[PDB]
Design a protein around this ligand. Structure first.
Ligand code: SF4
Ligand code: SF4
Ligand code: SF4
Lengths: 59, 157, 199, 157, 64, 134, 286, 54, 386
């Protein structure tokens, strides 16, 4: 049988474990590949506070 | 002194109020009268409306209602459970089988009335009595409890 | 639904059988296997997210906002019929004389042996009872006494709230039975005016 | 600081009491109390997280299994020489030498130390666990697996 | 359910009264509506320094 | 607790402060942040309440002596309790990781821990150890 | 002051537990086409009070063949744990307050076990263990759910903690399966349907029985407050009452499971799901 | 003796809590005295070293 | 011949009226030894001192859940030896009220089984319709449970006018009540997992174990006494037979529900076919006459005197008759010597036979399922202990 038949029979005979493993796989995949692609990309105290003021004052 | 007596009387009133309105019996599914008893706690009559809860143990049981015939083989067990009832306790006799034997009064293995084994406070007649009659009998039990005056007795002891 | 599933069987022999034999598949009463992504999602929605508890929950909740059948005894009573067999009672004639003539049919027919009768001729020559006792703690309220009596003397009255604190109060004598009959005569006569078309 | 020092002293008292009594249930109860009070006193050292870890683990997990094993394996054998055979004098004498007068203490030549409250950082603890002792964390994982597999292989069937 | 509705309202009212009373009592005790905030050793140090400074001010208050 | 050194009192000298600390009021915003102190007093109060409720029915209830009134009317547990032990220890291991801003290699090591955990757990699953027929 | 605050917390707990059992009775009646307690006081607004006073005046009976000290203390211990849990709910500032309450709830298992060994009842001996094993098994999943919750609990200073006042004032729409599994675990923790198979206090009586029920319903309310704080985005009376209403709703509509059945369910469906969700939340929150 | 057990337990607890501190403080007194003697001996040693070392 | 030696396991399951002693090697039941007789009232010997009419109320309290069915078997056993034909209208009334009684027995049984399992709502819900049918009983016999309505040659009284109206009105919504009853357990995974594949019974064992009623039907067995050995007007009635093939508690549950459906169908058919005519057999020498007839005729007065004192004399002989009881097959063996009292009256109870299956069925099960076994067995100790 192909992937489809075995997956169907397994999920019918045991859906919870397949759900758990699929969620784990999605998390692992997002950590490994998805995240480092689209979301991954000495000043003194006065500069930091000035930047904080600039960010806060407009909002 | 009169004020202390008045306080004693009011406390007795409150004690009777509490004990009457929260009587928890124990279930002896002996015979016919239990079905009337089961229907008495049902939606139409709502024994629970009158502060009545059936408990699995004698230890929380307040009084005993005998719903069904009592045999000689069952009498020691009934005395066992009643002797497990804590004080203050009462007994309610429902059904002629429980009353005096009734339709098995001349049998060889039937205890002619549960009176012969345990004391009884309320005798409810009928074979079977109406669930309405059981309501009336338990209300009369409440009336008997109302007339009780324990701390009044104890203060004059 | 009434369908069955693998793993939902509550045993070990059957569970061990179905996880190691496809015998349940041959059974048509078992829900058939999902065949596509849609059916798999339907099965997942069936198992997870409940969706079976939800229906009974909703029906019970509708019952919460629903009406009730509860009655407020003693300020409300139930429904009963004239044929009701309650407290035994002794009836008289409208002039005032006892209906019972001590034919002892009631005692003869009573399978409870709860009726004790003694009688002799009255000073006027009338055949009247000297002792008329019925053991209510022994009476089974069958009404066979009411069936046997040919003068409508003994009747089971519409009184059913007559519980006593002591058992001795239920040892009914002639006097208390006559008192009960004089009390409840009108209701019993009215019921007989209906029951006569059947009895 | 009377009560804090009293709680500190209670630890060794309970420790001796654990072996002192003959009822296994009493010993386990003493151990549970000792664990709780130990965690509470260590809380005075500023370890909120570690105290809860110790509490959770030992009370919820280990003591429960202790009581279960005892309850499935111990008919009362207290009179079975547990009171009639007594205790070895050499053991208590050695224990006195070791712990009452403590000829060989932990500090050795030092006789006084200052106890000072700490500052538990779960952030620093995590940094250490997963950056400085990650290898030991994996070794602990292997040890947990050893325990699980050995237990399930030593099953009495 | 009209019979249970009184109990339903009473439970909510009881919890409301209890929470309001506890709010008032703890506000009187702590004198700021943030005492439940998470605090590290830094905030603890600031709080204890401030308390000791208030005590020092009282000590120097009874000197003029 | 009461301070015993001026360094602990931030080098503030005087007698007023010592007595003030001696009879201070408890305040989370005062000197006892994260103190856990109300737990003990709650324990005392609950002990008192429970003891009183135990004692009271022995006072306001009649007593009668009866002989018969003084009478009462597996490894799956082993498996479950020992598994609970190990898994709770593992949860305690996991807890600090959830309380930090961990990094990617830290994440991978955590996943390694979880992988070993689930490996043992799944081995127990596949061998019939989670089927509680016994 | 602190003692007074403890008592001010205590009073609504007892009063409301009385009201909870009364309203559970009455709502069960409403869902059963009956009225329920209505004679004992105005609309039956006095039933639990008289019940408590009645069990107070009822005679406490002690077996002569066991250790009565544990028999007395076990309901006492459970009541103490309930009071301590309430104090930690309302009168605490611990950094791991949720973990504190979890560890507290882990302790309530003993009272059932203490009672089970105490009395000389074989079926108590068995049911105590059954209930113990159920709650113990579900405790791991509850801790895993808290682990998942702790992955986003941050204060303004930037430190990750378990403080209740720093929990977001919004519901967590992104953990609905986690919320559902946590709610079912809460249902399991209180011996309620569909986990009311185990009672353990069968040989108990009087105010001991009253304290057992007090501890049970207080733990139920504690878990309700925990759930409201965690998933419902705050702590309020409305949410407590709604959760209790839903719990009565579930009790009045479902039958209970078998022992090994909910054992299998918890050990093969709930804990692995919580583990996977915890891993996913940790991965995304990075 | 349930109440007897309670009495014995409480008596043991109180006696322990009042007696152990005395022994602890006796240990502290002995150690302080010994360290004072040690420091005096070391001071005398340093004095002798200064005398015979020029 | 047998010592005790190894005590080891010991159990006591309930003085409170079933006493059960079980044997487990742990969590799984290996032996189960019920002890009965706590309700043995010795009625069979008591019957010998009563006339046939006197002993009739004894049969009310043998199965106080289902009464008229208990009356019917004894009445038929009397009549067959008496060679008495029953009028058509009486047969209609008997069959209809028997169906109502069967409905009551099924309702109470299923509700008690649910409460033992853990469902409390259907209990309360179905007791309302049970109260309705109790009102029906009281209207026709003046007694809620112990009617003593069935008589040798007919019934005591005719139906009061206006009864069938309310019967039809009740039937107009009993289906809705049953439907709302099903949704609480039918589509539930919990109810099934509690009930599915618990206490499996085969056809061969069942016929070896003497099963009757719904338990027999759930084993793939085609059997109804109302269709194989019909009595009274049951042959005219057209209705279906539910059939299951697992011998499961869930299967028995569904079988009982479908039996209730078929009972409702028979109730409708009886309602729309009620005939006009005599309700008692015209033999006054066995059947009592009318009170009006008694009070104006010497012969009827004499017969009322004799029957109500001595009763009719059954010819010497023997017979056994059974009735398709809601709990199975209820039969009574009658031994006649020729007098006005039955010489020997043996009573056969289906629950007593079903109760004998506990030890073999409870093997391999769990303590959570013993209560399931008892509840699905549908046993009343009144008939079990006579
Ligand atoms: S009094 Fe009558 S109805 Fe009640 S249990 Fe006895 S025989 Fe049955
Ligand atoms: S009551 Fe009627 S039947 Fe009985 S003795 Fe009197 S007249 Fe005869
Ligand atoms: S009603 Fe029945 S038991 Fe009562 S007196 Fe009449 S015949 Fe006897």
């Amino acid at each position: 049988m192909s992937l489809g038949e075995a997956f169907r029979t397994a999920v019918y005979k045991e859906p919870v474990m397949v759900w758990s493993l699929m969620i784990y796989g999605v998390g692992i995949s997002y950590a490994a590949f998805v995240k480092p692609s689209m979301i991954e990309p000495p000043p003194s105290l006065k500069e930091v506070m000035a930047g904080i003021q600039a960010k806060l004052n407009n909002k | 002194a009169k004020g202390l007596e008045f306080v004693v009387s009011k406390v007795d009133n409150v004690v009777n109020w509490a004990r009457a309105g929260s009587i928890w019996p124990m279930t002896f599914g002996l015979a016919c009268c239990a079905v009337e008893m089961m229907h008495a706690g049902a939606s139409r009559y709502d024994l629970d409306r009158y502060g009545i809860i059936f408990r699995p143990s004698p230890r929380q049981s307040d009084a005993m209602i005998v719903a069904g015939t009592l045999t000689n083989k069952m009498a020691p067990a009934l005395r066992k459970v009643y002797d497990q009832m804590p004080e203050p306790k009462w007994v309610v006799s429902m059904g002629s089988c429980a009353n005096g034997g009734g339709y098995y009064h001349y049998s060889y293995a039937v205890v002619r009335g549960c009176d012969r084994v345990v004391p009884v406070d309320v005798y409810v007649p009928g074979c079977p009595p109406t669930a309405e009659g059981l309501l009336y009998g338990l209300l009369q039990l409440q009336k008997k409890i109302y007339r009780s005056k324990t701390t009044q007795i104890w203060y004059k002891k | 639904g009434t369908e069955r599933r693998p793993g939902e069987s509550g045993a070990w022999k059957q569970i061990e059988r179905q996880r190691y034999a496809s015998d349940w598949e041959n059974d048509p009463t078992f829900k058939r296997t999902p065949k596509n992504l849609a059916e798999v999602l339907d099965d997942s929605a069936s198992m997870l997210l409940l969706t079976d508890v939800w229906r009974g929950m909703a029906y019970t909740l509708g019952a919460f906002f629903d009406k009730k059948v509860t009655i407020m005894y003693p300020f409300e009573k139930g429904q009963l019929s004239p044929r009701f067999r309650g407290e035994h009672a002794l009836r008289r004639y409208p002039t005032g004389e006892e209906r019972c003539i001590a034919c002892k049919l009631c005692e003869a027919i009573c399978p409870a042996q709860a009726i004790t009768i003694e009688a002799e001729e009255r000073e006027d020559g009338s055949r009247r009872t000297t002792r008329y006792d019925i053991d209510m703690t022994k009476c089974i309220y069958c009404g066979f006494c009411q069936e046997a009596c040919p003068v409508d003397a003994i009747v089971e009255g519409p009184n059913f709230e007559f519980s006593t604190e002591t058992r001795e109060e239920l040892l009914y004598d002639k006097q208390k039975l006559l008192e009960n009959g004089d009390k409840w005569e009108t209701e019993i006569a009215t019921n007989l005016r209906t029951e006569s078309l059947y009895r | 600081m009377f009560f804090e020092n009293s709680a500190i002293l209670l630890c060794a008292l309970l420790s001796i009491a654990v072996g002192y009594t003959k009822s296994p249930f009493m010993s386990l109860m003493y151990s549970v109390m000792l664990f709780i009070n130990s965690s509470f006193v260590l809380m005075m050292l500023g370890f909120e997280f570690l105290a809860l870890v110790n509490l959770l683990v030992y009370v919820g997990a280990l003591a429960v299994l202790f009581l279960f094993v005892i309850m499935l394996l111990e008919i009362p054998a207290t009179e079975l020489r547990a009171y009639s055979r007594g205790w070895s004098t050499l053991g208590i004498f050695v224990f006195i030498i070791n712990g009452v007068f403590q000829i060989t203490p932990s500090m050795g030549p030092r006789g006084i130390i200052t106890g000072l409250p700490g500052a538990e950082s779960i952030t620093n603890l995590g940094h250490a666990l997963y950056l400085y002792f990650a290898d030991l964390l994996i070794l602990n994982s292997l040890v947990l697996t050893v325990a699980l597999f050995g237990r399930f292989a030593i099953a009495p069937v | 359910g009209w019979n249970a509705l009184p109990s339903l309202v009473i439970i909510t009212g009881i919890w409301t009264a209890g929470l309001f009373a506890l709010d008032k009592v703890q506000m009187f005790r702590e004198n700021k509506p943030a005492w439940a905030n998470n605090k590290d050793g830094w905030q603890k140090a600031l709080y204890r320094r401030d308390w000791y400074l208030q005590r020092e001010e009282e000590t120097l208050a009874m000197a003029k | 607790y009461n301070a015993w050194s001026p360094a602990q009192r931030y080098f503030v000298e005087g007698d007023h402060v010592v007595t003030a600390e001696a009879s201070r009021t408890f305040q989370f915003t005062g000197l006892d942040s994260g103190s856990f102190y109300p737990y003990v007093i709650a324990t005392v109060i609950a002990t008192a309440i429970s003891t009183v409720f135990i004692v009271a029915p022995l006072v306001i209830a009649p007593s009668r002596v009866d002989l018969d009134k003084s009478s009462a009317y597996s490894v799956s547990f082993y498996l479950v309790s020992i598994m609970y032990l190990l898994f709770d220890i593992e949860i305690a291991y996991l807890f600090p990781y959830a309380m930090t801003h961990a990094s990617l290699p830290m994440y991978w090591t955590m996943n390694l821990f979880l992988a070993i955990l689930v490996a043992g757990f799944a081995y127990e699953w596949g061998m019939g150890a989670l089927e509680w027929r016994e | 002051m602190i003692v007074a605050s403890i008592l001010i917390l205590i009073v609504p707990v007892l009063l409301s537990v009385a009201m909870f059992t009364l309203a559970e009775r009455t709502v069960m009646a409403s869902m059963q086409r009956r009225f329920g307690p209505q004679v004992s006081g105005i609309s039956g607004l006095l039933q639990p009070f008289w019940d408590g006073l009645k069990l107070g005046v009822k005679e406490p009976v002690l077996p002569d063949s066991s250790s009565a000290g544990a028999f007395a203390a076990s309901p006492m211990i459970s009541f103490v744990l309930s009071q301590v849990a309430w104090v930690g709910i309302c009168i605490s500032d611990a950094s791991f307050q949720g973990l504190v309450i979890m560890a507290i709830s882990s302790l309530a298992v003993y009272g059932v076990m203490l009672a089970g060994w105490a009395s000389n009842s074989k079926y108590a001996f068995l049911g105590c263990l059954r209930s113990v094993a159920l709650m113990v098994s579900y405790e791991l999943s509850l801790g895993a759910a808290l682990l998942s919750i702790g992955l986003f609990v941050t204060d303004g200073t930037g430190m990750k903690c378990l403080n209740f006042a720093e929990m977001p004032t919004t519901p967590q729409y992104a953990m609905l399966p986690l919320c559902l599994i946590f709610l079912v675990c809460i249902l399991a923790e209180t011996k309620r349907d569909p986990f009311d198979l185990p009672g353990y206090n069968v040989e108990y009586s009087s105010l001991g029985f009253a304290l057992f029920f007090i501890a049970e319903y207080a733990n139920m309310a504690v878990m309700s407050a925990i759930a409201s704080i965690y998933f419902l985005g705050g702590f309020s009376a409305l949410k407590i009452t709604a959760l209790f209403f839903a719990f009565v709703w579930t009790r009045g509509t479902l039958p209970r499971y078998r022992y090994d059945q909910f054992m299998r369910l918890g050990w093969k469906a709930f804990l692995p799901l919580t583990l996977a969700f915890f891993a996913l939340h940790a991965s995304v929150a990075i | 003796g349930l109440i007897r057990n309670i009495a014995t337990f409480a008596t043991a607890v109180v006696g322990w809590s009042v007696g152990i501190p005395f022994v602890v403080q006796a240990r502290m007194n002995g150690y302080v005295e010994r360290n004072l003697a040690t420091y005096d001996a070391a001071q005398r040693q340093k004095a002798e070293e200064a005398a015979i070392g020029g | 011949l047998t010592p005790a030696k190894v005590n080891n396991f010991t159990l006591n399951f309930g003085p409170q009226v079933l006493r059960l002693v079980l044997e487990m090697q742990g969590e799984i039941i290996m032996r189960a030894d019920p002890h009965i007789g706590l309700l043995h009232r010795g009625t069979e010997k008591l019957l010998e001192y009563k006339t046939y009419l006197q002993g009739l109320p004894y049969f009310d309290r043998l199965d106080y859940v289902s009464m008229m069915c208990m009356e019917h078997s004894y009445v038929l056993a009397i009549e067959q030896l008496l060679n008495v034909s029953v009028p058509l209208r009486g047969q209609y009334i008997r069959v209809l009220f028997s169906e109502i009684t069967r409905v009551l027995n099924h309702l109470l049984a299923i509700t008690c089984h649910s409460m033992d399992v853990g469902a409390l709502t259907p209990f309360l819900w179905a007791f309302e319709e049970r109260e309705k049918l109790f009102e029906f009983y009281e209207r026709v016999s003046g007694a809620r449970m112990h009617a003593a309505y069935f008589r040798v040659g007919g019934v005591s009284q005719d139906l009061p006018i206006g009864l069938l109206r309310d019967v039809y009105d009740w039937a107009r919504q009993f289906a809705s009540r049953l439907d709302e009853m099903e949704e609480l357990l039918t589509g539930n995974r919990i109810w099934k997992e509690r009930t599915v594949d618990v206490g499996t019974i085969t056809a061969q064992m069942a016929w070896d174990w003497g099963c009757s009623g719904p338990i027999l039907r759930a084993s793939g067995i085609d059997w109804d006494l109302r269709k194989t050995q019909p009595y009274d007007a049951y042959g005219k009635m057209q209705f279906n037979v539910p059939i299951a093939g697992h011998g499961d508690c869930y299967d028995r549950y569904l079988v009982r529900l479908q039996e209730m459906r078929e009972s409702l169908r028979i109730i409708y058919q009886c309602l729309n076919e009620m005939p006009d005519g005599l309700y008692k057999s015209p033999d006054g020498k066995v059947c009592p006459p009318s009170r009006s007839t008694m009070k104006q005729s010497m012969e009827a007065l004499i017969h009322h005197f004799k029957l109500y004192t001595e009763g009719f004399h059954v010819p010497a002989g023997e017979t056994y008759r059974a009735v398709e009881a809601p709990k199975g097959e209820f039969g009574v063996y009658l031994v006649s010597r020729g007098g006005n009292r039955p010489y020997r009256c043996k009573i056969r109870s289906p629950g007593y036979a079903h109760l004998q299956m506990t030890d073999v069925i409870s093997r391999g099960a769990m303590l959570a399922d013993v209560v399931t076994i008892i509840g699905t067995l549908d046993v009343v100790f009144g008939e079990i202990d006579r």
